[PDB]
Design a protein around this nucleic acid. Sequence first.
RNA 1: CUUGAGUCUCGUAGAGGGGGGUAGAAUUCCAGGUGUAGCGGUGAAAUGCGUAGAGAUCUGGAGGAAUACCGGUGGCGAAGGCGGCCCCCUGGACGAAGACUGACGCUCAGGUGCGAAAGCGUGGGGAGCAAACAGGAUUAGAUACCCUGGUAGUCCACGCCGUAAACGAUGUCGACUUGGAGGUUGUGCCCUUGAGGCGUGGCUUCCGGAGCUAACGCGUUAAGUCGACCGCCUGGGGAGUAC
Lengths: 51, 55, 88, 100, 117
Amino acid sequence: IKVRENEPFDVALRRFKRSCEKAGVLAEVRRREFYEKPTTERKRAKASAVK
Amino acid sequence: EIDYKDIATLKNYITESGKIVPSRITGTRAKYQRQLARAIKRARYLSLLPYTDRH
Amino acid sequence: SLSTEATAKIVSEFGRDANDTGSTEVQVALLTAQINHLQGHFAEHKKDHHSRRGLLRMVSQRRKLLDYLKRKDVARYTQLIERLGLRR
Amino acid sequence: MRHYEIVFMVHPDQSEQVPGMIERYTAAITGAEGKIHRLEDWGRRQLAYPINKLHKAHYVLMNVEAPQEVIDELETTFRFNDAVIRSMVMRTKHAVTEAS
Amino acid sequence: RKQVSDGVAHIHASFNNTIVTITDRQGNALGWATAGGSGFRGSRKSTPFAAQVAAERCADAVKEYGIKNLEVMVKGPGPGRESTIRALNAAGFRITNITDVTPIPHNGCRPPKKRRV
RNA sequence: CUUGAGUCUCGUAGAGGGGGGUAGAAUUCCAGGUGUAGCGGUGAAAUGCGUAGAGAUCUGGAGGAAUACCGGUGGCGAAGGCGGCCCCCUGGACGAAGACUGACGCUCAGGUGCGAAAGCGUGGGGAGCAAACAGGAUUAGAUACCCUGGUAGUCCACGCCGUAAACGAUGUCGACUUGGAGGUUGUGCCCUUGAGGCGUGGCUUCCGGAGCUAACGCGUUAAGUCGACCGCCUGGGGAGUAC
Ligand SMILES: [Mg+2]
Ligand SMILES: [Mg+2]
Ligand SMILES: [Mg+2]
Ligand SMILES: [Mg+2]
Ligand SMILES: [Mg+2]
């Protein structure tokens, strides 16, 4: 995620990092993998997404 | 979406990070999404597109 | 599966005449083609079990077509085996 | 006899070979009843990423319809030609011609 | 001592500690600082404030190089991820480019089990 | 005889299988530059790594494993299971204009084959993770949970093992029985001038009616209503143990 904004106005623009990469992708890989836990615990979200 | 050399089209189906955009966001059909993914993937391999931002 | 050409080709040598592909003799012959042609594909690789599953289905099936033919008319049966050299 | 959309990119400082390469590859194909249906020379081009140094390659199209035998022979040469780098090749999908 | 006027600032935003290393656009480190060394430890060195006193401390070590502008290379979660940058710029540093270099494998090595309570 | 079953023609989607290449991200390790006193870890710690210069950062190199995003209520498979891209070899499924065969079908004791992970043999490979093991910690104790390491193994080839909550805890085949919302794929009609709308086959989610059920629930993908064949149960423990 590259950010180079012309005209100095010190505005972080942390939207990119917090739009996909950064946390969420790291916290997801922090501990062990998943194996069987993903095919469920993750798909157990659709049981919620439905309603 | 059907061809890979058509980088001009695939760029629309890719975020700013380089990863292809989800199907729900774009709205595009699933059948088409799959066909797109393949074109995009092989396109990146021919250095016609980026993998991420760094390289 | 089998080439469209090699197919029509065999449909004539055993087919009741032409344009017909239901003839017992035809099927049996057609199967033997892949059955034999596949032996090469299986002679190599071997661990390709999933593909074998299809192979056996052809054999076991041909076994029925042949067995059936024998019941409906021993003649065609005996002759059929000769050209394809089957039944041990 | 099948179709393939072969596309190979050669090292930039080898651009002068690009043409020579094409003639040989093409000849080999047609030589055995080949049948080229698209020959595009994109020449030098910036790379998305520095694929093993240098960010500029020399892409070329082919989309030639010929028996797997020759196209296979050709695939190997690409490996024994330090000049050429990446190389991809897909199947028929009905001869393509023009555009790109 | 060499006068660079513009280099880059790396930030190791680790869930436990945060260290900032100022170096020219080449990679050659000019100076660094770390929350752990900036005083507080453990329960106190892993806070957003930690990186602040650290980053600002990294400047009072390299600013002596005549630096004017400098890009930012942020990698890793935890605090001091953003805190470090602010203090850096707030120090007069003419910021320019802020890019996240956090490592993200397209499914490679197997992460450690760890933590189980 | 043609409606069951099958063959042919042409299309369609797919992480179906076997073989061989190959790409990018990342980890680790080795070498060198910059640089300097911490890093690492936890609830704190400590073990450990650091002035023999770590960590950080940059450059080059070595190697193994897995393929972010796409990705899904998704797809394929007999089941086990199968995700980067490319080629080669190869199996099945579905639709439809039809053409052909003519009951060639369904089920299946024994039999034969396929079988996750772990494990076993021979020879390779070995980055990350990690039984064993060794330290540090916590505790009354801690042969654990946590931290620092780390062997088998995990990876490959070939042979063996044949088990699992091998689970939908629901055998296979076929026919009937209100509806709703959605997914995926084939196909037909419609100014298709459209995103499109309407039909109509395959596979698939959730909801629910009758009915069924001890209840929970199932509910046209039934656990409803029926027919064909098979497997299995007959109180708990002892015991899936002994012989
Ligand atoms: Mg451990
Ligand atoms: Mg095993
Ligand atoms: Mg072994
Ligand atoms: Mg299925
Ligand atoms: Mg229901």
